Design a protein around this ligand. Structure first.
Ligand SMILES: Cc1cc2nc3c(=O)[nH]c(=O)nc-3n(C[C@H](O)[C@H](O)[C@H](O)COP(=O)(O)O)c2cc1C
Ligand code: SF4
Ligand code: SF4
Ligand code: SF4
Ligand code: FES
Ligand code: FES
Ligand SMILES: [K+]
Lengths: 45, 432, 214, 263
């Protein structure tokens, strides 16, 4: 409310884990959409 | 009519309002700071309108180059060809002296997300691949937290902001390579192979990631893009000199009393920016020996030139250097300039991907030569030999890392040849 | 040194026991799903990183397992592993002490912090503590140039460091307490060390100088 | 109906769109110096010796991968192109090991010949050269990897022509080495062809090792009889004794490859 410019609030990164990035990427997948397909399952296929 | 002394940017007209994390970096604080506001209107206006207003804003590539962002982005306004279209935001931030991108990612990630959205709509991209470096794990996690917040809010994903557009923002993490900052090297790094840059007879607008058309932009430009759309192109055009408009995140470090990062308007006096935002050079302006304007790639400049130099691309180009990434690196009179430049050459040697011959063999040779120079183990002829080697490296490499390693050597020679000569003479007399 | 030729050892051999935990497998499949169909090799860099997180370092068995799970020739995996620096092809300590020594960060006496690390741990650059806790290695620029000489430990950045603060950090790591990430003096992240030369007025809210049409 | 006119040293040549600068130069007769470009393998563009000058263009383009466009005049013998070739070859010859008397490629080495023609006559390298540990890939190809110029031609040949993806690179910078990392012999019916592919003595024929010099062997063209493909070969014999079998280009039978049972 009083525009407390004097403090830092981006301290949420302190309580992060080893898998935090990948774990937070995991459940984010259900909000994604079907990826495009190039046909063959691999360039070598 | 036209501003003469381009400087002292006002707080009201600043793209990034949360540089130092003084406000909530989540969706709530971003909306409080004007972010994610009226995005649907920009989405529905039309890609051509966004591209035209970007051209009107005169935005130049804020990632190290100086290409007009409008022209580069409009290179993708071609019709569909079956292949998907991709926008990629470079967040490698490997150039020494650069600190802006980390700050925007970890303090204003929602501006970055809205930038990917508006850019992808302007260029018709289906998804965004923000390539952050491997070290920035906390920054990447914060960015992905903001991405999840936006996904839940419905701003991105299927029916992005209700405009019928379908966009995704994947964040691929790097693995500790400076060459990955190169756009084609970044493309292969995303594709799974090594970070070797690709030759450019084909361009990313034609062939990019996975072979589909891709366009690599920088964190700063995409971050300012939604603000460019909202406030207006002419509002951006007001700041800075002609063809050198906009505001930039200057990262001031080296031997500055208070090294920091400030969002200052373009074509700013270097002395004024150093004195006010940074606090001046340690020991005053008289104690300044050299200034590296925009990171390791940009050649250094001596204090006599530093007295009066505007901080736009063209002004520093006339100063036989480049704006680069606006990475101010000040070195005082107590600095061994030879040692610092040799350390930069060592960094470039350690970061060369080794693909093409001039960078793989040439940069290592320059590293050895500069290592001998620091101890003065040479003769006056090897200074000209080093100049010739640097010229041979220039314009002969696949990517611009060869030129970015040759330029510091050229600047050091051009502005401190007497220092090398005298150090060599001292070593010669000592070895008697 | 870091020789880029894998010589078979009794510890680092293709028969070295390695696998992926089921949660790690779910993370792998999500990562693979995050790429276009038919270009699964694009997931090689993150997947390998996962093999690091659950193993600390990357044994050659992990290399082959990544190749199998990504249907990619093992040579490409070996190439991407030897190319990128963060992948530890050799066993490493619990706390990877990476000290930046590029020009912007050496200019503010990073050598003092490096020597403080050497003295506190009794370990020269490039070795691991005998109790397998710290590994002091030298790195190029890590992105926090405006900050004073910083040090990277596994996943955390520590900026604005002075030998005493890093003595505290090291002996606090020895005691299991994780030091607070961020500069170890004053400044929160990147503001001017003196005060605040910008962003003093409250930022303007939704709608400010917005173009009429929009 | 689609041919575009391009200029090579002023001469006007009709080239099909998509033609690279190197092929356009070859049409006239000029053979642009190259190490990493093989007409059978993919284009790489890392050797940087095909750097040729395009008129009204302040940048030496890579003729091995640059597609020509209308109105280009390729100045093959321009001073800028000659200086670019000299600099690139100085870079190549900097860390090369002084093995010419002990290297079997001596007398038929691409590096030696291009140095004789497109290159300086001295060196300004007054430092210590690099050295790379040798790698074993079987009993057919002897590898002295310190002579490798990292043209990655063997890697591309193994990936595409041979199919097996066991050759590649390791590391970056001056220390990035071409090999197999882990110990694995490059075993294929077309393996020995890498000996031909390598422009330097890094990959050499083990049975032929230290047996004869290229300038003294008489070449007699013949037809292989091992398999039924009938690949055309060149028997190089000296003193009335067969020394080695090399492939001969036919573009229908065997392209320019032979099997290991033929070599
Ligand atoms: C060696 C090298 C490193 C680079 N590193 C970065 C980087 O860290 N961040 C970045 O945005 N651009 C970087 N670039 C520039 C990109 O290759 C590319 O030109 C730019 O990102 C395009 O976007 P822009 O026009 O907005 O700058 C680098 C270029 C080179 C040659
Ligand atoms: S200049 Fe260096 S980093 Fe760039 S492609 Fe050539 S070898 Fe790789
Ligand atoms: S490869 Fe060529 S230059 Fe190298 S040692 Fe052999 S003959 Fe000499
Ligand atoms: S071994 Fe020979 S073919 Fe392979 S990269 Fe080296 S020089 Fe080229
Ligand atoms: S120079 Fe030390 S972090 Fe960039
Ligand atoms: S032949 Fe064109 S660069 Fe190697
Ligand atoms: K050979």
């Amino acid at each position: 409310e009083p525009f407390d410019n004097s403090t830092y609030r981006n301290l949420q990164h302190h309580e992060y884990s080893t898998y935090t990035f990948l774990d937070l990427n995991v459940e984010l997948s259900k909000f994604r959409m079907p990826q495009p397909s190039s046909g063959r399952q691999s360039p070598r296929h | 009519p036209k501003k003469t002394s381009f400087g002292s940017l006002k707080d009201e007209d600043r793209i990034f309002t949360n540089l130092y994390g003084r406000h909530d970096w989540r969706l709530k604080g971003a909306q409080s700071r004007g972010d994610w506001y009226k995005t649907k209107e920009i989405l529905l206006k039309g890609p051509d309108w966004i591209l035209g207003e970007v051209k009107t804003s005169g935005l130049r590539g804020r990632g190290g180059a100086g290409f007009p962002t409008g022209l580069k982005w409009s290179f993708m306004n071609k019709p569909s060809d079956g292949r998907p279209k991709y926008l990629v935001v470079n967040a490698d931030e490997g150039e020494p002296g650069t600190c802006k991108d980390r700050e925007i990612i970890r303090h204003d990630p929602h501006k970055l997300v809205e930038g990917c959205l508006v850019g992808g709509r302007a260029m018709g991209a289906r998804a965004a691949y923000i390539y952050i470096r491997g070290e920035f794990y906390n920054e990447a996690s914060n960015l992905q937290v903001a991405i999840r917040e936006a996904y839940e809010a419905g701003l991105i994903g299927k029916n992005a902001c209700g405009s019928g557009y379908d966009f995704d923002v994947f964040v691929v993490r790097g693995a500790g390579a400076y060459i990955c900052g190169e756009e084609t090297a970044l493309i292969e790094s995303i594709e799974g192979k090594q970070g070797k840059p690709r030759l450019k007879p084909p361009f990313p607008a034609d062939v990019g990631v996975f072979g589909c058309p891709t366009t690599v932009a920088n964190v700063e430009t995409v971050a300012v893009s939604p603000t460019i759309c909202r406030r207006g192109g002419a509002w951006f055009a007001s700041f800075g000199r002609e063809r050198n408009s906009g505001t930039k995140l200057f990262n001031i470090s080296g031997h500055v009393n208070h090294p920091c990062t400030v969002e200052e308007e373009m074509s700013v006096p270097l002395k004024e920016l150093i004195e006010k935002h940074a606090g001046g050079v340690i020991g005053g302006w008289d104690n300044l020996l050299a200034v590296i304007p925009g990171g390791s790639s940009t050649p250094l400049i001596p204090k006599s030139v530093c007295e009066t130099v505007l901080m736009d691309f063209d002004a520093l180009v006339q100063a036989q250097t480049g704006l680069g990434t606006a990475a101010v690196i000040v070195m005082d009179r107590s600095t061994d300039i030879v040692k610092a430049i040799a350390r930069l050459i060592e960094f470039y040697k350690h970061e060369s991907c080794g693909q093409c011959t001039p960078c793989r063999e040439g940069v290592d040779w320059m590293n050895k030569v500069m290592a001998r120079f620091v101890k003065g183990d040479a003769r006056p002829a090897e200074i000209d030999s080093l100049w010739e080697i640097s010229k041979q490296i220039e314009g002969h490499t696949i990517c611009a890392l060869g030129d970015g390693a040759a330029w510091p050597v050229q600047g050091l020679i051009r502005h401190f040849r007497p220092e090398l000569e005298e150090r060599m003479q001292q070593f010669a007399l000592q070895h008697q | 040194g870091a020789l880029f030729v894998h010589r078979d050892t009794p510890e680092n051999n293709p028969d070295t026991p390695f696998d992926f935990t089921p949660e790690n497998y779910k993370r792998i499949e999500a990562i693979v799903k995050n790429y276009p169909e038919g270009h699964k090799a694009a997931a090689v860099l993150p997947v390998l990183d996962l093999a690091q997180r659950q193993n600390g370092w990357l044994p050659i068995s992990a290399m082959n397992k990544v190749a199998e799970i990504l249907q990619v020739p093992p040579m490409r995996v070996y190439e991407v592993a030897t190319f990128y620096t963060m992948y530890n092809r050799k066993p490493v300590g619990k706390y990877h002490i990476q000290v930046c020594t590029t020009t912007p960060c050496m200019l503010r006496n990073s050598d003092s912090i490096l020597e403080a690390i050497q003295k506190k741990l009794g370990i020269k650059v490039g070795e691991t503590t005998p109790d397998k806790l710290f590994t002091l290695i030298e790195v190029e620029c890590l992105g926090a140039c405006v900050n004073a000489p910083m040090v990277q430990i596994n996943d955390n950045y520590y900026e604005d460091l002075t030998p005493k603060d890093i003595e505290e950090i090291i002996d606090e790591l020895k005691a299991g307490k994780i030091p607070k990430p961020g500069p170890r003096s004053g400044r929160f992240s990147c503001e001017p060390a003196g005060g605040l030369t910008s962003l003093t007025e409250p930022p303007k809210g939704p709608g400010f100088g917005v173009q009429a049409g929009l | 109906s689609n041919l575009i006119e391009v200029f090579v040293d002023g001469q006007s040549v009709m080239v099909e769109p998509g033609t690279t600068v190197l092929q356009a130069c070859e049409k006239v007769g000029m053979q642009i110096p190259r190490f990493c470009y093989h007409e059978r393998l993919s284009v790489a563009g890392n050797c940087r010796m095909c750097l040729v000058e395009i008129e009204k263009a302040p940048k030496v383009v890579a003729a091995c991968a640059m597609p020509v466009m209308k109105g280009w005049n390729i100045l093959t013998n321009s001073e800028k192109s000659k200086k670019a070739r000299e600099g690139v070859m100085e870079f190549l010859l900097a860390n090369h090991p002084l093995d010419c008397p002990i290297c079997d490629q001596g007398g038929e080495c691409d590096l030696q010949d291009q140095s004789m023609m497109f290159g300086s006559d001295r060196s300004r390298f007054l430092e210590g050269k690099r050295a790379v540990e040798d790698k074993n890939i079987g009993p057919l190809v002897k590898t002295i990897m310190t002579r490798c110029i990292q043209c990655t031609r063997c890697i591309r040949f193994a990936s595409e022509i041979a199919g097996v993806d066991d050759l590649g690179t390791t590391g970056r910078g001056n220390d990035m080495q071409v090999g197999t990392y882990i110990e694995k012999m490059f075993m294929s019916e077309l393996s020995g062809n890498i000996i031909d592919i390598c422009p330097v003595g890094a990959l050499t024929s083990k049975p032929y090792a230290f047996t004869a010099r290229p300038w003294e062997t008489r070449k007699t063209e013949s037809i292989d009889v091992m398999d039924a493909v009938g690949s055309n070969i060149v028997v190089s014999t000296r003193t009335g004794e067969v020394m080695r079998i090399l492939p001969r280009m036919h573009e229908d039978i065997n392209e320019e490859w032979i099997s290991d049972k033929t070599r």
